[PDB]
Amino acid sequence: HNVDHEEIAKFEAVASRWWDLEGEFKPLHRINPLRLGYIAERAGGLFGKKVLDVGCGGGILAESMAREGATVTGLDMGFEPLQVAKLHALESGIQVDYVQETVEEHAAKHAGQYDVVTCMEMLEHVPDPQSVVRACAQLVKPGGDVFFSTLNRNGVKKFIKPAELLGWVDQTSLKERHITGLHYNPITNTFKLGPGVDVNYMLHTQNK
Numbered sequence: 160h161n162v163d164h165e166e167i168a169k170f171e172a173v174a175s176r177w178w179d180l181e182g183e184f185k186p187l188h189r190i191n192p193l194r195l196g197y198i199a200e201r202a203g204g205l206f207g208k209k210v211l212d213v214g215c216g217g218g219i220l221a222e223s224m225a226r227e228g229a230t231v232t233g234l235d236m237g238f239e240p241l242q243v244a245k246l247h248a249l250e251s252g253i254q255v256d257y258v259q260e261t262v263e264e265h266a267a268k269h270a271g272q273y274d275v276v277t278c279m280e281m282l283e284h285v286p287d288p289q290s291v292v293r294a295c296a297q298l299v300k301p302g303g304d305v306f307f308s309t310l311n312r313n314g315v316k317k318f319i320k321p322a323e324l325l326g327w328v329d330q331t332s333l334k335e336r337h338i339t340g341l342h343y344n345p346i347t348n349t350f351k352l353g354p355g356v357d358v359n360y361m362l363h364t365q366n367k
């Protein structure tokens with residue numbers, strides 16, 4: 160029910176291009192090592208942890224987390240993205256569980272089961288983002304980590320301001336721990352996480 164069918168339809172339409180490093184999803188492929196590194200550092204490693212990737216799409220982050228030895232469940236409402244994610248995981252020889260349902264349904268059935276919940280580039284596509292934040296808080300174990308991010312900007316989607324997201328987080332059992340932005344660094348000629356969240360961000364929260 161907390162789903163925008165038009166938004167889902169857009170991702171279903173481009174699903175076949177998901178793993179093209181030079182296609183539409185290039186920025187996510189480029190961004191992935193950086194977000195993975197941040198998640199692994201902030202959560203204290205992923206080996207052996209139960210992890211839920213909310214709005215996983217084609218599985219760019221999910222598969223990368225499973226590669227580091229996590230037990231990963233990827234959740235999405237799109238049919239074709241999950242078909243692509245499953246096939247790509249098989250091709251890679253990586254075990255990932257992909258499910259088609261809403262985060263609210265998953266939360267009601269799997270409360271407090273996850274060590275880590277990641278919710279990347281997803282909130283701006285939902286009709287009621289606060290409900291998603293509440294759900295992720297319910298899905299995580301006590302002391303577990305929940306990450307939210309918008310590192311990819313477009314012309315399209317809406318931008319949810321970090322200050323607004325913090326308000327939603329504050330109504331739940333999650334506590335903000337760290338926030339960072341993504342920036343071009345001319346000296347190294349690379350993109351790096353660092354201060355400044357005016358335009359993009361990644362937020363680390365921990366369940367209390």
Ligand SMILES: Nc1ncnc2c1ncn2[C@@H]1O[C@H](CSCC[C@H](N)C(=O)O)[C@@H](O)[C@H]1O
Binds near residue numbers: 163214215216217234
């Ligand atoms: N209401 C909803 N419930 C579950 N998934 C949703 C959703 N609305 C959008 N999505 C999914 O969110 C994805 C956004 S693209 C983000 C993919 C992945 N999180 C990554 O960063 O690599 C799309 O695959 C879309 O189908």
